Design an enzyme around this catalytic site. Sequence first.
Site, PDB file in Angstrom:
ATOM      1  N   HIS B 220      90.556  50.285  31.687  1.00  0.00           N
ATOM      2  CA  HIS B 220      90.681  49.427  32.859  1.00  0.00           C
ATOM      3  C   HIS B 220      91.730  48.353  32.608  1.00  0.00           C
ATOM      4  O   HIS B 220      91.542  47.471  31.769  1.00  0.00           O
ATOM      5  CB  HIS B 220      89.336  48.789  33.211  1.00  0.00           C
ATOM      6  CG  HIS B 220      89.386  47.901  34.415  1.00  0.00           C
ATOM      7  ND1 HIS B 220      89.801  48.347  35.651  1.00  0.00           N
ATOM      8  CD2 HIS B 220      89.071  46.594  34.573  1.00  0.00           C
ATOM      9  CE1 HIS B 220      89.741  47.352  36.518  1.00  0.00           C
ATOM     10  NE2 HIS B 220      89.301  46.277  35.890  1.00  0.00           N
ATOM     11  N   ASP B 222      94.216  45.299  34.080  1.00  0.00           N
ATOM     12  CA  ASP B 222      94.550  44.324  35.108  1.00  0.00           C
ATOM     13  C   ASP B 222      96.059  44.111  35.136  1.00  0.00           C
ATOM     14  O   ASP B 222      96.653  43.699  34.139  1.00  0.00           O
ATOM     15  CB  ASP B 222      93.823  43.002  34.855  1.00  0.00           C
ATOM     16  CG  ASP B 222      92.322  43.179  34.727  1.00  0.00           C
ATOM     17  OD1 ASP B 222      91.769  44.080  35.392  1.00  0.00           O
ATOM     18  OD2 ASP B 222      91.697  42.418  33.959  1.00  0.00           O
ATOM     19  N   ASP B 333      85.258  45.494  37.926  1.00  0.00           N
ATOM     20  CA  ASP B 333      85.510  44.068  37.757  1.00  0.00           C
ATOM     21  C   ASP B 333      85.509  43.335  39.094  1.00  0.00           C
ATOM     22  O   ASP B 333      85.574  42.106  39.140  1.00  0.00           O
ATOM     23  CB  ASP B 333      86.838  43.847  37.030  1.00  0.00           C
ATOM     24  CG  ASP B 333      86.987  42.434  36.500  1.00  0.00           C
ATOM     25  OD1 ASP B 333      85.954  41.796  36.204  1.00  0.00           O
ATOM     26  OD2 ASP B 333      88.136  41.960  36.381  1.00  0.00           O
ATOM     27  N   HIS B 548      91.957  42.276  42.194  1.00  0.00           N
ATOM     28  CA  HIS B 548      90.687  41.559  42.084  1.00  0.00           C
ATOM     29  C   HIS B 548      90.746  40.306  41.212  1.00  0.00           C
ATOM     30  O   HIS B 548      90.106  39.304  41.522  1.00  0.00           O
ATOM     31  CB  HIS B 548      89.605  42.502  41.549  1.00  0.00           C
ATOM     32  CG  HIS B 548      89.904  43.056  40.191  1.00  0.00           C
ATOM     33  ND1 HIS B 548      90.726  44.144  39.994  1.00  0.00           N
ATOM     34  CD2 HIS B 548      89.489  42.669  38.961  1.00  0.00           C
ATOM     35  CE1 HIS B 548      90.805  44.405  38.701  1.00  0.00           C
ATOM     36  NE2 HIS B 548      90.064  43.525  38.052  1.00  0.00           N
TER      37      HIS B 548
END
Lengths: 67, 940, 940
Positions: B220, B222, B333, B548
């Site tokens: 994952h 970001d 998240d 997010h």
Amino acid sequence: VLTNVYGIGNCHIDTAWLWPFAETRRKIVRSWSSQCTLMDRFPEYKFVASQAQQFKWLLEDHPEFFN
Amino acid sequence: XXXXXXXXXXXXXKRISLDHDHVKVWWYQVSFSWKSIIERDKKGELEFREANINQPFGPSWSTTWFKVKISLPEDWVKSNEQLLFQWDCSNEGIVIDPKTLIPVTAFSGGERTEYVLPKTSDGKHFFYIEAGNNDDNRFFHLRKADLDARALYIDFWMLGDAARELPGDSWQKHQARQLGNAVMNLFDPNDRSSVRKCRELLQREYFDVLTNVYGIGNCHIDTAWLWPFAETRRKIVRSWSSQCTLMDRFPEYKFVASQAQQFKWLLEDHPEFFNKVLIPKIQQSQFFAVGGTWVENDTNIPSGESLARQFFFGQRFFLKHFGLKSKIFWLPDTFGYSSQMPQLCRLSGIDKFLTQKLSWNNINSFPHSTFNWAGIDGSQLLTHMPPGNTYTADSHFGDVLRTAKQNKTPEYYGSGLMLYGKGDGGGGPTEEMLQKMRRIRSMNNRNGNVIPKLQVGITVDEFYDDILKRTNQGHDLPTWSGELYFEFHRGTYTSQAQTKKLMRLSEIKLHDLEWIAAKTSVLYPDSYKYPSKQINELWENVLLCQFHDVLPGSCIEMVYKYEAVPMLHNVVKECTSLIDKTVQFLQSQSKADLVEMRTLGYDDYIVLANGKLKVIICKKTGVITSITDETLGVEYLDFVIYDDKPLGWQAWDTELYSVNQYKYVTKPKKVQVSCNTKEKCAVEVIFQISEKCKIKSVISLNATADAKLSKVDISTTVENWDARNKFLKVEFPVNIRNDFASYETQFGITKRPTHYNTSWDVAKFEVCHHKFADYSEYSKGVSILNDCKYGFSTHGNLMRLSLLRSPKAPDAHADMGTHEIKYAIYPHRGALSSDTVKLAHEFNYCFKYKLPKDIGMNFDDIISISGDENVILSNIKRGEDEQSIVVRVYESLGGESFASLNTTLNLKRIEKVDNLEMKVYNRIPIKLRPFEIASFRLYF
Amino acid sequence: XXXXXXXXXXXXXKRISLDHDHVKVWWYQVSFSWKSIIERDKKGELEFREANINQPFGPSWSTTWFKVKISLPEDWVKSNEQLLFQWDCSNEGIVIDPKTLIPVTAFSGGERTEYVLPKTSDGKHFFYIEAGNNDDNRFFHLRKADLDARALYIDFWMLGDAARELPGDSWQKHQARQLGNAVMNLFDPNDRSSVRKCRELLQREYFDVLTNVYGIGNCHIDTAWLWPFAETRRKIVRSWSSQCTLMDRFPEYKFVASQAQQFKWLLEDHPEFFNKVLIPKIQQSQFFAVGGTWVENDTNIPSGESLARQFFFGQRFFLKHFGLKSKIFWLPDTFGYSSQMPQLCRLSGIDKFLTQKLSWNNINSFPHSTFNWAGIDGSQLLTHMPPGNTYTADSHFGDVLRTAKQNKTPEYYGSGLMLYGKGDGGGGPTEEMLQKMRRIRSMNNRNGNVIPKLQVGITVDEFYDDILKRTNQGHDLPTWSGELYFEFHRGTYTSQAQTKKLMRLSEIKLHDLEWIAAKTSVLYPDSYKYPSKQINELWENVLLCQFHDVLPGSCIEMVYKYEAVPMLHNVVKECTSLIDKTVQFLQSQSKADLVEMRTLGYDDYIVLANGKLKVIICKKTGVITSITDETLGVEYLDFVIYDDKPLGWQAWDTELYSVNQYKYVTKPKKVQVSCNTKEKCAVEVIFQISEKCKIKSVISLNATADAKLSKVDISTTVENWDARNKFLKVEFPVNIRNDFASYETQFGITKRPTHYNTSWDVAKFEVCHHKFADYSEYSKGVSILNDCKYGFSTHGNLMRLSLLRSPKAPDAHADMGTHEIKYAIYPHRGALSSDTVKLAHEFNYCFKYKLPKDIGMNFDDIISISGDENVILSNIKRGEDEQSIVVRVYESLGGESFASLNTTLNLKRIEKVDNLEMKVYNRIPIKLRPFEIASFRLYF
């Protein structure tokens, strides 16, 4: 994980207790008969007997067909 | 009990060999691309220089390249040995062994890691490795070897570790202890012949209710976080390379990617040889794209258009060579979830969803982890929920049986769920010893199916085949209506409103030019008219900051400046350039054009005199006393009282001090009035506090029917100074009794009570919102419109909006500087109950006026026969490739009325089409279901 | 649940003020006494120099002095403020504010600490502080202030901490939470007027089954440890000064001292003004001397004479101005306890004892912590036992209610037990905030007696008055026979035998010259004859290394070299000087004098031919096969097989690897024989192992009745090389079945089984011994004599002696170097059952022969009419001041026979006298009880 769970059906009989020997002598013959009817009904069953004299008690009371 | 005898002994204490090559080693640093540095290497003498030792550094944004030229020692002897080179992992970088440059290799994995040298080709090669700084010094040494000896060391380390996790009452714990015993016997007195032999003996000691335990290695990432996008763009290429080297080493491995744009990032950076790498990788097996989504974002703040593009523009890759996909939807998240998601999923051709947080294990009127989500729309969503251990359970996991037990309790099913890899960082690593992990777990438990079988190679697609069989189709099932509620970590959501002000204004602005630009199609034909290629590039840059983590403003100071940079700004600047562009050859048919989108007093006696309503601030108090309707008869006592309470927590969550009195802004105020007119009335009242700071709010409104409007407008302007770690709010107590709070969510209106669920933990209760929130018994109430603030709270029926927040997080830009805030208070009636919703959301509209030379007639109302006040059309846009356009509508008021849809058009045809802009054969519904999104497509 | 809201908030976050004075500050260092440096200060310019900043350093044995000259700022304003100077605590040092030098102030307390400046005298003074290095840099800044504000901060910190310890189910936890709430309210927004007011409000919120909770602040100091004696001699003066400044600050405080010699150390170093400090301090109150013992030591290894002197020579201080004492006996760090202690205590006038370890909480055939100890002698000992939390429970304790609950479970009584202060370090600190500790604990609980009352000022003397009342005098009570058994941490006990060889040889040697030097009394009169003042100084130096930590050899390398220094050596060297001295004017009556103290073959056929016994080593095997008695008929198979197993633990405890095979020393041996004679027979057999090392043992013995003796002598000489972390032992399996193991303890023979108690934890079972251990069914058995090794083990009846140990502790002298070991194996019979004990212990005697010129007659046997084979006289010595001499005897064989004592003398009288050498009016017993120590005194 190798493991095993087993058991053996058994009857522990006191030859003299709060009921007498002469009366429990009739009680031991009930232990053998429960197995005999169970054998034809279910196989592989296991029974054990702590009394070697238990044989003689059955042989004295039922000498003919039960020998 | 010999517990610390077996466990801590042998765990601490040809074979592993360490050789040192000092020469041939080069180092490089840029204090000022892999393709640019390859031309700068062999030519002359550049900043590339001999290192041969450990190189210390200091804090910098610079990256330090490193070159190791290694010659294979001897011939045969050290060839059989395993060749390895250990590096100390820095903040970021890449590792290459290029000729000229073929490869790209993985770096971003944890501080411990392995780099294998090919034993197939005998010769000399090169190594290119850079280290990102933020300093971290690298420890670099060549390591030779054996594989069988190190295997036993790892297997034993995972053995005794599993012995501790196993119940002491079970014989397995006593067994594993004895297994750790016999191994330590021959391992202690330094014997190679014994170790290799004991490894075989241990395997003999190993091998001698239907359930399944599986997992999928994932990363994952970001795209914007405490490290920037440009730097993390180099971080994503390290995630792919770790899999590529793992594929040849181990089969059946599974990887998933939440970013569809991740493909494009790799295709842009490595277009040549790595475009042909993905095709055998993705098509055959071992790779799955989850959700096919362009962005991973919070769904509460933006509109449905943001959720519409990410599906459509993420499905664009499917048109290329791609398209092995999954039905799972992944937002681990993401904080909070929309209620329209069950409706959006089925239409997007994606039937499953995953949620990390926002759940509890107990009888909640809810059974378990696994859940079938039924939205307020009535549609159902089958979703797969990980346990309370979240995604950090299987992340960097050598502990084996540890979390295996804690996974089984929240979940029933026939099987559990495990997510491998870390979701916190520049990107998650994937360990190379997972091959042994699956194998050693198959050593402890036997094979064949009796006891649960261990397979890490199964895909969620086959997992969803199992859920269709075992459990019933269902009628009565796990049921939770609306959203989910757990500790939200709202935090920065209401903090740093300035990045919201820029985005929310850019939100509507980019949402502005979309449809009307297709209304000029007839005017000047070429392709006709639409910025198809132009507006496509626009949505590329905007969705990048909508992620997010990025959107709420939780991040370091460096990328925070990149949020207020042209990235957000130029979007508005380019859109305001285009709106003044397209008008030139369009508005020329308009002499004087008013452009708006739709489809059909006293001081001492303290009064502002008009018919509609009355709102009065008492003298010297500074607090509004009476808001009262004459016709309705409702009188209010306790309005608009600003409240300031400090905050002692970080950016993530919000934790107030224990019973801390919130300081009121009431003070020796003075009275003033801005202007004098029937058109314009603004009365000014000053507020002040300790460590003097000027807190200004404004009062604007239009009277009745000379000014006309039903709603007030109150905008707040505050320049922050001095004291930090404070949280500012303005209270609007209704003085009324209602067990229900009316609030408009994304594409609809959700129904939430005045009191939080009885399972709620955190004291402070605050709710994120789009525009307005109301309290209605349907005969009356109070409506509050607001701007730039997405947060609010339910106090026991006291309306409180969050103006600003200043966290103690390492960000100095969340503390001080000016802010422009705006909100409103509106009177409510049963007849105006549908009006307040209509006057709330889109009020963000900005008046603009411009005129060209005059030839023409400027009045045309082009909309065809719909006229539904209970419905609102959020988005209508064109397609990709034709240029067919789509029309998406949703019902504002639902749960009571069934909206009849007469919506249609002329000169063309129309068919119902889902959110993915994919052709669907039911036709246009004559009646819309309550809380239903109606999307259609238009063809020539 | 707002658990982390109240607890972690306000705990982190005129009044406290920090001022900096750079000038007037001086620093000093010795790279090469407080009285010596005072003359070197004012004169000229010496190494004392201006510092004014932080001074870094590096590892050294040096000490760094520091001088701060402070002028009182302004007059009144900062005078009311609390004056303080913060220092960073180094390894060691002292702090002084001398004029010229009156004071000595405390240092050794923890890294945080306070130094108060007198507000009584207005002027300028000086400061002298040194810092011991081992480097630690000091942070020194002047700190002004208020006392009321800091009090609330501390009280609140101890409040919320007590809230966590209290049960959450109780309302007290919810109460204390609300108490932590209201305080945080006025504390947060930085208001001095609110803080002082809220402190009063908190006290109002505070004040609104007979039990007692008490404690005594104490400091346990090891005279020799990882820091040396000379350096810790400066450390003990810091323990006294911390009390002195505490007395004026707080009353009722109680301190205890396990060292009677501690007084002398202070009287030698500070004889002038600090001799007059102790008298008002000790006599009035607040000070108690525990046990009046000269040394704190392990009682297993040495003889009773070592325990005799420490009582007597520690009672010498009572003759000075001293003598407020307690009945408690304190050996917290001592590993193991003797069985003669109940007999030694009652005679020494000390009725109580304290034991840290060696206990368990369960039904053991034992109730609780509090215990009445009944020795194997039959005498009873009432002892006070601390819980499983030991002495570290109340050590540096701000946690309040934390360990209060865990103290109540092991103990019943009417009350619990707490020991304040740390027993690990150069010495324990005593905190100055204990005044508030007792007060704040009286804030939580009310006053008057209903609930348990909190008093830290009660003395153990009054505590023993409570136990005499509540509980019965008793017949059936808690009962444990013999010693106690828990994890021993034997460790260095068998490690580094070389320090035992020197001590054990010095033990007997110093125990040698004692009595016989009083037998020359008649020869040449002055005082008559005895080294009264001479032998008194001898015992001064010897007892210094006999302490519990020092004697086994567990320590750093520096002081370990001080163990093999003349400290141990010169004692033997001075005693061997005196034995050659006193002989000159004594032995002159002896022409030829034999001086001893008492009172009345083949190879290929593998045999050493004689009558008594036969012991045979098989050919090429290296292992003894048959040890067999012809008359008795016992044949042995499995003797003297050396076994080497490694060790993976530190010096403290001993932990073997899990199921590690012990390497046998058997190898391709060769056969040889030392000499050839009937008098001397030694057959040599070589042993070797991997990483070749020569392990040599010898064989010596005298045949029968040309040589005469009943016992073999086998001495082992091994020079260690290469591999470390090993543990060497020699096995003597008896091949016999016995549930009992005969072993001779200090002053008697204890009875211990072949198997350890069923409550035993640690796998490895080893026992510490004096000389020999036997296994006897009384008709036969096997006796093993040994030297320099105090350890052995019971394997299931396999006798195993520990030759050497090499711990992984940071000591490099415990690994390599030569060693001289000696032991024996003896045949056992019912008639020789009393003989084996007699031939074991004192065999350590060394033959010595010397002759002068001849005038006289050298044969005199002076002992008068005793003749008890079952009794053995260990010690007979003189007194202090007269020169009356004492006679102490103890029965070797006991538990069966009642020994009739006819022991008496002539020309003088005799009376029974206890171990303290104090006059006791029963007279000389005509019969001795089994396992009884009989001590008497002789007067002219």
